[PDB]
Amino acid sequence: PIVQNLQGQMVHQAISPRTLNAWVKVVEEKAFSPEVIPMFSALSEGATPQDLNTMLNTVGGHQAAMQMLKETINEEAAEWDRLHPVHAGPIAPGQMREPRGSDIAGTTSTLQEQIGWMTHNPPIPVGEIYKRWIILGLNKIVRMYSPTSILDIRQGPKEPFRDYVDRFYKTLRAEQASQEVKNWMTETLLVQNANPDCKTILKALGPGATLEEMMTACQGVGGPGHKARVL
Amino acid sequence: PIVQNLQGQMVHQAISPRTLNAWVKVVEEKAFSPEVIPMFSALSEGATPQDLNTMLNTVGGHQAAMQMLKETINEEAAEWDRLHPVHAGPIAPGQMREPRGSDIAGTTSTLQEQIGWMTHNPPIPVGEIYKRWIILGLNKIVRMYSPTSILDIRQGPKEPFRDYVDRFYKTLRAEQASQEVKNWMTETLLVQNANPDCKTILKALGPGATLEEMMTACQGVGGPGHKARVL
Amino acid sequence: QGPKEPFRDYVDRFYKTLRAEQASQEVKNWMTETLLVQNANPDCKTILKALGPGATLEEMMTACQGVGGPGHKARVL
Amino acid sequence: PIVQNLQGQMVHQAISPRTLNAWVKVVEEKAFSPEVIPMFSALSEGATPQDLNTMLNTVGGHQAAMQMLKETINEEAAEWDRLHPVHAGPIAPGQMREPRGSDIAGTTSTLQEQIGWMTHNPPIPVGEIYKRWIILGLNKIVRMYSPTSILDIRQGPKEPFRDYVDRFYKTLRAEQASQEVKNWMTETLLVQNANPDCKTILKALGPGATLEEMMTACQGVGGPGHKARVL
Amino acid sequence: PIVQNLQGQMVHQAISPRTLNAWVKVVEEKAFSPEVIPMFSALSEGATPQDLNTMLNTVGGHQAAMQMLKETINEEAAEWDRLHPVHAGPIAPGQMREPRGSDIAGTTSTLQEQIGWMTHNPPIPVGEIYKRWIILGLNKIVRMYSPTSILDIRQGPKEPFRDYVDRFYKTLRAEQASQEVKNWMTETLLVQNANPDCKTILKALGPGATLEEMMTACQGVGGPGHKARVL
Amino acid sequence: QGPKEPFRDYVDRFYKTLRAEQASQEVKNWMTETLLVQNANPDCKTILKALGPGATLEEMMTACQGVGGPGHKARVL
């Protein structure tokens, strides 16, 4: 991808092998977790298609997941051949001709060509669009990965509050749903998926009690709360 | 390799020890894996033949595969000499004196001449052809490695679709065949080797189904179900 | 259509009869559409009903290929 | 149809009674047979749409299948105006009214006028497109009749190579697929549909053995029998 | 095909429906019998490749054997293409670029061009060469069909001399070999494969004399070596 | 929806309940998309799954009217 600002006009360098090794290593231990998605967004300096495509192609084990990302890229590219500029076609000689849907990615565009329209006239954000398509594919993958749904989780009698809460939050990252729905749901959901022993104090928090307020009390009573009768 | 762009003409800098060290480690963990072929494209930052040849020669363990790869390259080099624009005879001073098939090899052409046809005059794609010859030879090696011959992959009585699809994509990667043929085969072959219970689900899904739709369908609850019998 | 009569012999009786219908072309299309569902036997009617609205003769023929004689069970699962 | 060139300009002749008797006998004998499509091509001296439509309308037993063919012809006729060049109604006086989708059909044209657009100005291929539409329709009829399929050919222990070969190429009379597909599909099927004992001979002969070579080898093998060996 | 010379230039007419019905009918009644090959050769009036191809594809049930003939045509066309590259390439006005080996067969050349190179310029033997290749494929089919080999001929104790002679000449029809080799074998085999009782008489007749003379001698012998003299 | 409970009864109970829950309409419709097949009895649930994702309430209700109603002999009781 293109890098270099201080010395002047950008140069097309390849992604570091140390970064490439780190990417392969992360996939070994964190195969499908949602926590890897912002890491990818953060370190992808210059979202140049073939360079990024090479990262997908160097993945080990669960390569089947990469094939799903490729189908998503092709599908959004197919959408880009209709809803977005499909155009007249013809263009004057000595111009970069502008990209079609499959030209956004690495499918029909040669690597030098990709760099050209990202450096000659004001940049075409083909990499940003390609990155967005990969993120859309990742959203489908995490949703498919998640084993339990929101109402499936119901705390056992010998299970503690923290285990139940960890499972809920792990699940919540992969739900692919709106923040407003989450906040509105949060008021009633926490009491509903709890066990009978933990429910007593959890339900006692009452009106206007937020997560900090609830957690402070829950760490005070400890474990899964106490029994239903003192005798 | 010869590299540099903004500051001026390309300068010979030897390949980093990090790349060599990483290549040896990858060979130790997964010697014949298909992910090595994109890794080679990523690590070959400047396709100069003698420098590229170091990656081939530094491999210890599976030398017999490397010997076969070298033999395939020797044939491609011979084909380049006798079929792709055949060499003439003597030529006037101040020329590169166009490379023969044997000349392309690191044990034949000297570095001053070899770098010369890559930057003293408009570049000859000597690195691209050598790299391409290495890649199609590595395509032969992954085909040799294959434990399962595509059709060999089957689904047992207790083997879920998620385990089965992972195995199916893994065997498919080392195939070495056309996209149309694979597209035609994929829709029937997966169903053909499926277990009778899972085969009914695939039969029910039917025509107009894409991989994303099939994955979405395969995500939910399994087993036969619960509705009453009318017969 | 009878209890063990297949679509092949049932449809043939309709198409043979249809030749001597003597009526408007626009009306003939409109009449033809619900007839196959209406005059079918339970097993055949159930699969035709499953195909539902917007079906063409070519699509119905494609579906009817897999039935196997008059029928037995009108759904895969 | 319109024929004649040795005696001067073409004249519209009536369809032969000898050909009509043969057409009726072929339909009575074997209406859904695959050889009907080249036989129809062979029998069709002159391609005038209305005259050709006589053959379609003189149908006996397979009237229901023929009406599906009529529905397909109506779709192809719509495609002529909606997918292929639409042209326009206003045109210069004395022109042969540039044949529209409705005009091609025998049920929406006058014979004298139809002969006119096939002869007044450079010939419009109205008969050829109508013949192509009939062939496309007939191709569908085979798929709505066939009681055999590609992977549904199973060779029993007492079923000879002659019986198996006959059955195998019979299912390929209903294949209705591209040249690329049938050429590159056939080898897989030959060993797959063959009996376990027969597979031993086919595997031994292997790639490099043509259909003639395979036929020659199996002509020496003879019946499978209760014999211990294959020699 | 193009036919008729008496009234001036040749005209394109189809094959008679009575003849087409008879051709299909003879194939149905005689199947793989060697008598089909001279019938095809003798009654094929008008050697036009496009019509030869359609005529061949009117075969019913026993189509599997004809598939090997179709594969044989592919090989013979390629062999002719390899044999004559001599004039392939550029061309000047007043020529039709000549027919290539693959266009000899009516599967890539069009009817108008086929007629043109059989009536404009001095006729090219394209139909005759294509028919010759079809006959070669038919010769391969009869050899493949063959029920028994010439030294596998045996005459039982209750089997008449006439039955043995008929079976022997029937077997000699499918022998496909040089006249001298066949005559040399035929001369010694008559005594060799005869039953002991009949063989005793045939050995008494001994070497020499032609088929007419031998049949004249055998006219007074009869049966399977019957011990009465009822003739 | 119980073992032999009518589609008419099930929809009526759901709608009667639904207009007394005083909530955000966007949020309510969004869950209503999967609620109909989620609480359905196996027989009806099987038909709702045949219809599958997408389509209007009118399209779904149109299909449901055409398949008829319950049997009468039970098994869990």
From Swiss-Prot, chains A, B, D, E:
- Annotated region Interaction with human PPIA/CYPA and NUP153: where? 57-95
Region PPIA/CYPA-binding loop: start-end pairs? 85-93
The leader peptide range reads none
Q: What is the effect of changing residue 37 to S?
A: Loss of infectivity
Q: What is the effect of changing residue 59 to A?
A: Loss of infectivity
Q: So which domain of life are we looking at?
A: Viruses
- Which compartment or compartments is the protein found in? Virion
What result is annotated for mutating residue 57 to D?
A: Reduces binding to human NUP153. Does not affect binding to CPSF6. Reduces infectivity to non-dividing cells. Retains infectivity to dividing cells
Q: Which region ranges are annotated with the description Dimerization/Multimerization of capsid protein p24?
A: 145-231
Modified positions (Phosphoserine) in chain numbering: 16
Write out the PTM section of this UniProt entry: Phosphorylated possibly by host MAPK1; this phosphorylation is necessary for Pin1-mediated virion uncoating.
Could you give the subunit structure recorded for this chain?
A: Homodimer; the homodimer further multimerizes as homohexamers or homopentamers. Interacts with host NUP98. Interacts with host PPIA/CYPA; this interaction stabilizes the capsid. Interacts with host NUP153. Interacts with host PDZD8; this interaction stabilizes the capsid. Interacts with host TRIM5; this interaction destabilizes the capsid. Interacts with host CPSF6. Interacts with host NONO; the interaction is weak.
Known function: Forms the conical core that encapsulates the genomic RNA-nucleocapsid complex in the virion. Most core are conical, with only 7% tubular. The core is constituted by capsid protein hexamer subunits. The core is disassembled soon after virion entry. The capsid promotes immune invasion by cloaking viral DNA from CGAS detection. Host restriction factors such as TRIM5-alpha or TRIMCyp bind retroviral capsids and cause premature capsid disassembly, leading to blocks in reverse transcription. Capsid restriction by TRIM5 is one of the factors which restricts HIV-1 to the human species.
Name of the featured protein: Capsid protein p24
Q: Gene for this protein?
A: gag
| Portion of the parent chain present | 133 to 363 of 500
